[PDB]
Structure formats: structure tokens, C-alpha cells
Amino acid sequence: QRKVLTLEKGDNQTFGFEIQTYGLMVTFVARVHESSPAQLAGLTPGDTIASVNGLNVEGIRHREIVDIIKASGNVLRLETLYGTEESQL
Amino acid sequence: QRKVLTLEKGDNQTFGFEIQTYGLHHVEMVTFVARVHESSPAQLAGLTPGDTIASVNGLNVEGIRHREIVDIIKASGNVLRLETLYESQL
Numbered sequence: 001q002r003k004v005l006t007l008e009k010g011d012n013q014t015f016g017f018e019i020q021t022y023g024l025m026v027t028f029v030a031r032v033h034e035s036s037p038a039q040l041a042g043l044t045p046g047d048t049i050a051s052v053n054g055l056n057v058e059g060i061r062h063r064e065i066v067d068i069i070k071a072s073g074n075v076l077r078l079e080t081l082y083g084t085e086e087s088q089l
Numbered sequence: 090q091r092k093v094l095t096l097e098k099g100d101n102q103t104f105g106f107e108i109q110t111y112g113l114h115h116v117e118m119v120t121f122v123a124r125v126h127e128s129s130p131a132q133l134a135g136l137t138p139g140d141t142i143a144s145v146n147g148l149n150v151e152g153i154r155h156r157e158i159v160d161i162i163k164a165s166g167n168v169l170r171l172e173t174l175y176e177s178q179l
Contacts, residue, residue, distance in 0.1 A: 015179045022141060028113055030176065046111045066177050081114040086155045
């Protein structure tokens with residue numbers, strides 16, 4: 001049971017988050033900046049992205065998944081499986 | 090890909106790095122190397138951030154949780170041996 005959400009960004013600004021892909025390939029949100037688009041949007045560290053704009057990303061190569069995200073322009077659509085960053089409270 | 094590295098440091102000092110552990114889904118735990126302080130054994134050893142710590146002193150730390158990695162590192166004293174796996178803003 002995932003949780004979808006869409007991010008709105010300014011033209012010259014960025015969504016404000018970073019991500020990390022990892023083999024065993026899987027990618028999650030490693031960090032979110034304050035007052036960022038992703039923060040407001042409610043993106044959380046530890047959270048896995050199952051698919052961007054339908055396009056299921058579960059597996060893809062970093063560089064590859066990166067493009068799609070960047071290529072999405074100033075509006076992004078995400079469905080995520082909750083994750084957690086241990087230092088977080 | 091496993092990049093081995095070994096650090097040594099003294100009583101009243103620290104290896105110089107910080108870690109982050111994520112509990113993921115597809116719960117899988119994963120530990121990365123966060124900050125790596127300047128003038129630190131970790132630096133000299135060439136450890137680099139973003140790396141996935143897969144092995145600590147010969148024990149496998151994947152799937153293991155933060156405080157366990159943290160305990161295993163504390164158990165060996167002034168010497169530490171890591172095996173790391175050889176990140177983009179949006």
C-alpha cells in the first residue's frame with residue numbers, strides 16, 4: 001500500500017531532493033532540503049519511489065531514472081513506499 | 090567492486106566519519122557513509138561519502154542495523170577495517 005504525491009517546482013528552482021540507487025538495483029530518497037518542493041510535497045528520507053508518472057521505476061539504473069525525473073520538467077508525480085532514516089525522529 | 094580500507098587511530102580520537110542507515114521497502118536496512126571529516130584517518134584512507142558499507146572488520150554489515158554496525162566498530166578499538174562498494178540532486 002503505497003502513497004502517491006505530486007511535486008510542483010518553480011521554473012528556475014529545483015525539487016530539492018537527492019536520491020540513491022542501490023543494488024543487492026533500488027533507489028530511495030537519501031535527503032530532502034528545508035522548505036523545498038519535495039519537503040512541502042511531503043517527501044521523506046528512506047522513502048522508495050515505485051514509479052514516476054505511471055512509469056514504474058522499481059529496478060532501473062540510477063542515471064536512467066535520474067533522466068526521467070529531470071525530464072519531467074517542473075511537475076513531478078510520485079508513488080512511494082514509506083522508508084525511514086534512523087537518525088530521524 | 091569491494092574497496093577494502095583499514096584505519097588506525099588513537100585513544101581519544103575517532104576514525105573521522107559518519108553513517109546513515111535506511112530501512113527500505115520494495116524492510117531492508119542499508120548503511121552509507123555520511124560526512125567524512127578533514128584530517129581524519131578515514132580521509133587518509135581515502136574513504137569517500139556515498140559509499141555503501143558492506144563489511145566491517147570482516148563481518149558483513151548489510152541487513153544489519155545501525156547500532157549493530159556501531160557496536161561492531163566500537164568492539165575493535167583503535168583499528169577498523171571496512172569494505173565499501175566502489176547520488177544526484179533533483
